[PDB]
Design a protein around this motif. Structure first.
Motif, mmCIF file in Angstrom:
data_model
loop_
_atom_site.group_PDB
_atom_site.id
_atom_site.type_symbol
_atom_site.label_atom_id
_atom_site.label_comp_id
_atom_site.label_asym_id
_atom_site.label_seq_id
_atom_site.Cartn_x
_atom_site.Cartn_y
_atom_site.Cartn_z
ATOM 1 N N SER A 131 -7.410 28.883 -6.117
ATOM 2 C CA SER A 131 -7.352 30.291 -5.733
ATOM 3 C C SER A 131 -6.722 30.444 -4.354
ATOM 4 N N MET A 132 -6.624 29.327 -3.635
ATOM 5 C CA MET A 132 -6.009 29.336 -2.317
ATOM 6 C C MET A 132 -4.496 29.263 -2.379
ATOM 7 N N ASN A 133 -3.924 29.655 -3.519
ATOM 8 C CA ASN A 133 -2.491 29.643 -3.763
ATOM 9 C C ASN A 133 -1.855 31.018 -3.620
ATOM 10 N N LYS A 134 -2.663 32.073 -3.549
ATOM 11 C CA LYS A 134 -2.200 33.450 -3.613
ATOM 12 C C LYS A 134 -2.058 34.018 -2.208
ATOM 13 N N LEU A 135 -0.939 34.678 -1.956
ATOM 14 C CA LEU A 135 -0.638 35.198 -0.637
ATOM 15 C C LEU A 135 -0.747 36.710 -0.636
ATOM 16 N N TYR A 136 -1.237 37.237 0.477
ATOM 17 C CA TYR A 136 -1.115 38.644 0.803
ATOM 18 C C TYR A 136 -0.072 38.769 1.899
ATOM 19 N N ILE A 137 0.873 39.672 1.700
ATOM 20 C CA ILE A 137 1.890 39.996 2.688
ATOM 21 C C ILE A 137 1.618 41.413 3.168
ATOM 22 N N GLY A 138 1.440 41.581 4.481
ATOM 23 C CA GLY A 138 1.086 42.856 5.056
ATOM 24 C C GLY A 138 2.091 43.360 6.079
ATOM 25 N N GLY A 171 3.219 49.272 1.762
ATOM 26 C CA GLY A 171 2.769 48.635 2.978
ATOM 27 C C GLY A 171 2.360 47.180 2.852
ATOM 28 N N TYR A 172 2.271 46.639 1.638
ATOM 29 C CA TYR A 172 1.787 45.278 1.454
ATOM 30 C C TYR A 172 2.244 44.771 0.096
ATOM 31 N N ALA A 173 2.057 43.470 -0.120
ATOM 32 C CA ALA A 173 2.517 42.838 -1.349
ATOM 33 C C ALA A 173 1.701 41.584 -1.606
ATOM 34 N N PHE A 174 1.897 41.017 -2.803
ATOM 35 C CA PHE A 174 1.281 39.761 -3.212
ATOM 36 C C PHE A 174 2.336 38.858 -3.834
ATOM 37 N N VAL A 175 2.205 37.558 -3.576
ATOM 38 C CA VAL A 175 2.963 36.531 -4.281
ATOM 39 C C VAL A 175 2.091 35.283 -4.333
ATOM 40 N N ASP A 176 2.320 34.461 -5.351
ATOM 41 C CA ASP A 176 1.630 33.189 -5.515
ATOM 42 C C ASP A 176 2.568 32.036 -5.193
ATOM 43 N N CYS A 177 2.014 30.995 -4.627
ATOM 44 C CA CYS A 177 2.748 29.777 -4.348
ATOM 45 C C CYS A 177 2.279 28.672 -5.292
ATOM 46 N N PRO A 178 3.087 27.635 -5.508
ATOM 47 C CA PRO A 178 2.722 26.659 -6.545
ATOM 48 C C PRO A 178 1.444 25.888 -6.237
ATOM 49 N N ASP A 179 1.061 25.755 -4.969
ATOM 50 C CA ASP A 179 -0.233 25.196 -4.602
ATOM 51 C C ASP A 179 -0.618 25.709 -3.221
ATOM 52 N N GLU A 180 -1.783 25.253 -2.745
ATOM 53 C CA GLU A 180 -2.328 25.728 -1.478
ATOM 54 C C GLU A 180 -1.596 25.155 -0.275
ATOM 55 N N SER A 181 -0.921 24.015 -0.438
ATOM 56 C CA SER A 181 -0.122 23.470 0.650
ATOM 57 C C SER A 181 1.103 24.336 0.911
ATOM 58 N N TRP A 182 1.784 24.772 -0.151
ATOM 59 C CA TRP A 182 2.922 25.672 0.027
ATOM 60 C C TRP A 182 2.482 27.019 0.585
ATOM 61 N N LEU A 192 -0.155 27.683 2.464
ATOM 62 C CA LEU A 192 -0.453 27.499 3.881
ATOM 63 C C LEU A 192 0.830 27.360 4.686
ATOM 64 N N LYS A 193 1.813 26.636 4.147
ATOM 65 C CA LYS A 193 3.096 26.542 4.828
ATOM 66 C C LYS A 193 3.736 27.917 4.994
ATOM 67 N N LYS A 223 9.392 45.216 11.771
ATOM 68 C CA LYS A 223 7.949 44.983 11.815
ATOM 69 C C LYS A 223 7.635 43.521 11.531
ATOM 70 N N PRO A 224 6.946 42.809 12.441
ATOM 71 C CA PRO A 224 6.418 41.475 12.107
ATOM 72 C C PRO A 224 5.568 41.466 10.836
ATOM 73 N N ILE A 225 5.979 40.696 9.823
ATOM 74 C CA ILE A 225 5.205 40.632 8.587
ATOM 75 C C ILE A 225 3.917 39.850 8.827
ATOM 76 N N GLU A 226 2.875 40.208 8.088
ATOM 77 C CA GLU A 226 1.665 39.409 7.987
ATOM 78 C C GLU A 226 1.716 38.652 6.670
ATOM 79 N N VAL A 227 1.413 37.356 6.712
ATOM 80 C CA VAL A 227 1.242 36.553 5.508
ATOM 81 C C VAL A 227 -0.098 35.845 5.646
ATOM 82 N N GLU A 228 -1.017 36.135 4.725
ATOM 83 C CA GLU A 228 -2.402 35.681 4.786
ATOM 84 C C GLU A 228 -2.809 35.214 3.398
ATOM 85 N N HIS A 229 -3.854 34.387 3.327
ATOM 86 C CA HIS A 229 -4.490 34.153 2.033
ATOM 87 C C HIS A 229 -4.933 35.489 1.475
ATOM 88 N N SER A 230 -4.652 35.722 0.192
ATOM 89 C CA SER A 230 -5.144 36.923 -0.473
ATOM 90 C C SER A 230 -6.631 36.756 -0.772
#
Lengths: 158, 160
Positions: free
Chosen positions: A1-8, A39-50, A52-53, A67-74
């Motif tokens: 579940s640590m593969n999903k990103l929130y972009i803010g 104002g925000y979005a979601f994308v998934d990465c192939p694993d939690e290492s990507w 986090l990267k 605007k500086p984007i925010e990228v956080e664990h969703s």
């Protein structure tokens, strides 16, 4: 579940293609499409290492439409309970020092270093209760330590 | 045709009678016999809509001899080209939301809604080319949207 990103912090006219290029520029693969809201979005990465990267490479560092984007664990609100991730930890920080900061806000139920090739360290922390993690997040997120600014955010609790 | 089913993740003990009773309980007719190979089977439904109902009622929801069976459109590899079916779309999704996902992977030559008794939606999508559909399938299958997990599989692209 640590593969999903929130972009803010996205402007209203941010499009999927904007985010695609940002991830392509940073050479981060995604395993699904960019779902863009207002104002925000979601994308998934192939694993939690990507994922986090992506966070380390992009959050607060890349601007889109000025605007500086925010990228956080969703993390859904119901899963923001006891668990946090701490980023931007000074490279060779003694764990005794980090512990002395963590325990001012509760009993650390769990603490695990997360492997990373960045200069700085990352650790996941489970506090003993919801209220402890919340206070720790309020007090540690943004805390300046040896000219590094700790970045503290929720990760999914169960 | 889109009434032919592939049934996968079968045990090596599975007999046609196992599959007859499964379709019978789920109230799905078949238009011919079950052909059991080794870990998988083929069967035909009377039309496309019964075939779709089989997929939604049965796939991953029924276990036989301890393994959950898989049910999908039977599509030979050479017929997996431009055309995909997308299932388990959240009921009220604005089509513009789905479209913003689809176009990340190529040009959508056509999109057709499929009748279904399900509360979720189903569409058949034709991309311009085989690489776009293959990319869309890899990226959209399992994609989670408003608490629904999209299910994307090929359908026969017999003409191309």
């Amino acid at each position: 579940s640590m593969n999903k990103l929130y972009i803010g912090n996205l402007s209203e006219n941010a499009a999927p293609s904007d985010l695609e290029s940002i991830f392509k520029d940073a050479k981060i693969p995604v395993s699904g499409p960019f779902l863009v809201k207002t104002g925000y979005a979601f994308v998934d990465c192939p694993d939690e290492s990507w994922a986090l990267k992506a966070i380390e490479a992009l959050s607060g560092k890349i601007e889109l439409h000025g605007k500086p984007i925010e990228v956080e664990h969703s993390v859904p609100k119901r899963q923001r309970i006891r668990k946090l991730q701490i980023r931007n930890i000074p490279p060779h920080l003694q764990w005794e020092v980090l512990d002395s900061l963590l325990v001012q806000y509760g009993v650390v139920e769990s603490c695990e270093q997360v492997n990373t090739d960045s200069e700085t360290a990352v650790v996941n922390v489970t506090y003993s209760s919801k209220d402890q993690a919340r206070q720790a997040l309020d007090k540690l997120n943004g805390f300046q330590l040896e000219n590094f600014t700790l970045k503290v955010a929720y990760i999914p609790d169960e």
